[PDB]
């Protein structure tokens, strides 16, 4: 203008959108139990 | 190691050195245990790396 200030007024960026955080539950797996040697007792069934 | 802290515990007849090496590795224990649980690692990426 006559005093400076601009005619065509200003441009306004659109500001960024706030982002939707994310987690996950990674997994494991480990070995199963395995069996022994089996050892014969003394006893009968019942008592066993 | 993990070995020879356990020699260097159950004695209750240790040098100063002994209980300082013992000492220095149960605070690097608790700084791995900080570094883990801080960070979040259920393990499956921890034990990987």
């Given at each position: 203008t006559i005093d400076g200030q601009p005619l065509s007024l200003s441009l306004y960026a659109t500001p960024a959108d706030p982002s939707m955080l994310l987690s996950a539950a990674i997994t494991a797996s480990q070995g199963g139990g395995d069996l022994p040697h089996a050892v014969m007792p003394m006893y009968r069934f019942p008592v066993i | 190691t993990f070995d020879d802290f356990m020699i260097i515990a159950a004695?209750?007849?240790?040098s100063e050195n002994e209980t300082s090496n013992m000492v220095a590795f149960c605070q690097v224990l608790g700084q791995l245990s900080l570094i883990v649980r801080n960070i979040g690692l259920s393990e499956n990426e921890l034990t990987l790396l």
């Amino acid at each position: 203008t006559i005093d400076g200030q601009p005619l065509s007024l200003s441009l306004y960026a659109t500001p960024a959108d706030p982002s939707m955080l994310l987690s996950a539950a990674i997994t494991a797996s480990q070995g199963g139990g395995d069996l022994p040697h089996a050892v014969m007792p003394m006893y009968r069934f019942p008592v066993i | 190691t993990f070995d020879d802290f356990m020699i260097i515990a159950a004695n209750r007849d240790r040098s100063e050195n002994e209980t300082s090496n013992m000492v220095a590795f149960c605070q690097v224990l608790g700084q791995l245990s900080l570094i883990v649980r801080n960070i979040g690692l259920s393990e499956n990426e921890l034990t990987l790396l």
